[PDB]
Design a protein around this ligand. Structure first.
Ligand SMILES: Nc1ncnc2c1ncn2[C@@H]1O[C@H](COP(=O)(O)CP(=O)(O)OP(=O)(O)O)[C@@H](O)[C@H]1O
Ligand SMILES: Nc1nc2nc(SCc3ccc(F)cc3)[nH]c2c(=O)[nH]1
Ligand SMILES: [Ca+2]
Ligand SMILES: [Ca+2]
Ligand SMILES: [Cl-]
Ligand SMILES: [Cl-]
Ligand code: NA
Ligand code: NA
Length: 159
């Protein structure tokens, strides 16, 4: 068993309803238990800005699944919640489930790259992560508290 940390995002189709449904669905992942859920946060879109604000959260998920098996399940949940791929890079979506961390694992497979490649630059990932895991240390030894103390991230407001 290991603890995975998953980022949640939604900016379409009633984000509060999409995230609450995703949390129920994450509890149905086999060989896995939710440990902790962050507050929900209403965040301005990074990347393309011509889209609605996001509801962002994070979840701690204790699992004995393999990393890619966990990825199968989060992809499934997205697809089952009406996630449709458009050609636009970084367009709006009903649900996004990003594996931020999988224990202390460092993975760069075809389908899966962990830690999430850009999470240490995203307040919408790190603030909810700190709320559920203040003592977190990344695979490379960097402390989550230290990143947030040192680096400028806009203030996050709750939903
Ligand atoms: N840590 C991870 N969590 C989830 N998917 C990941 C992943 N690392 C790689 N992937 C791969 O990422 C592919 C594209 O996912 P998308 O959701 O469209 C990117 P996004 O989440 O919009 O951008 P971002 O990764 O910059 O946040 C997935 O099909 C999956 O194979
Ligand atoms: N607030 C908010 N904005 C979001 N933009 C995306 S697309 C990826 C992306 C692209 C460039 C960048 F610099 C940061 C994130 N996903 C988001 C999310 O979950 N929340
Ligand atoms: Ca994402
Ligand atoms: Ca994603
Ligand atoms: Cl899309
Ligand atoms: Cl979508
Ligand atoms: Na479960
Ligand atoms: Na656009």
């Amino acid at each position: 068993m290991t603890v995975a940390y998953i980022a949640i995002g939604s900016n379409l189709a009633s984000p509060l309803e999409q995230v609450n449904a995703a949390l129920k669905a994450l509890g149905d992942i086999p060989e896995s238990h939710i440990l902790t859920v962050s507050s929900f946060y209403r965040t301005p879109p990074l990347g393309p800005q011509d889209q609605p604000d996001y509801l962002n959260a994070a979840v701690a998920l204790e699992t004995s699944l393999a990393p890619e098996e966990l990825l199968n399940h989060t992809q499934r949940i997205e697809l089952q919640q009406g996630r449709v791929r458009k050609a636009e890079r970084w367009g709006p979506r009903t649900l996004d489930l990003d594996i931020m961390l999988f224990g202390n694992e460092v993975i760069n497979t075809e389908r899966l790259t962990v830690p999430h490649y850009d999470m240490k630059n995203r307040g919408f990932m790190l603030w909810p992560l700190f709320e559920i895991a203040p003592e977190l240390v990344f695979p490379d030894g960097e402390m989550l508290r230290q990143i947030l103390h040192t680096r400028a991230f806009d203030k996050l407001n709750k939903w």
